[PDB]
């Protein structure tokens, strides 16, 4: 019934740094992914209370969303780009796991993921 605490976006014990690849990922999020027409269901944690999804956090034990990722980038939470890419993969996979093929939300995730992977394939360095 209740929502879990959302994923942390800062941790005083976790080392932080800025890298040009992490800056590129933030640029991709802000310029391209955040304002995509299909972005809005991914811009914040799934609110199982509002949506009355008592099973969501029984099925999804590693939640992730683009609002969390964006804040992590803005707070320099990550040590490397791979951590951030893994968070994106987790977000997309969670959507595929909870929902079912043919759902419009799955089509939205697939389109966002296709665009994200295009941007990954253009990562600098």
């Amino acid at each position: 019934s209740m929502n879990p605490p959302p994923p942390e976006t800062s941790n005083p014990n976790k080392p932080k740094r800025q890298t040009n690849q992490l800056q590129y990922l933030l640029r991709v999020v802000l310029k391209t992914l955040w304002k995509h027409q299909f972005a809005w269901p991914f811009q914040q944690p799934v609110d199982a209370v509002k949506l009355n999804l008592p099973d969501y956090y029984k099925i999804i034990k590693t939640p992730m969303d683009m609002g969390t990722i964006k804040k992590r980038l803005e707070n320099n939470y990550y040590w490397n780009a791979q951590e951030c890419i893994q968070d994106f993969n987790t977000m997309f996979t969670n959507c595929y796991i909870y929902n079912k093929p043919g759902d419009d939300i799955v089509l939205m995730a697939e389109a966002l993921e296709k665009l994200f992977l295009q941007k990954i394939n253009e990562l600098p360095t």
């Binding site: 269901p41 799934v46 949506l51 009355n52 999804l53 969501y56 909870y98 929902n99 079912k100 759902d103 419009d104 939300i105």
Partner: peptide
């Protein structure tokens, strides 16, 4: 599905 269409 999550009922997102019902939100609005």
């Amino acid at each position: 599905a999550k009922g997102l269409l019902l939100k609005g």
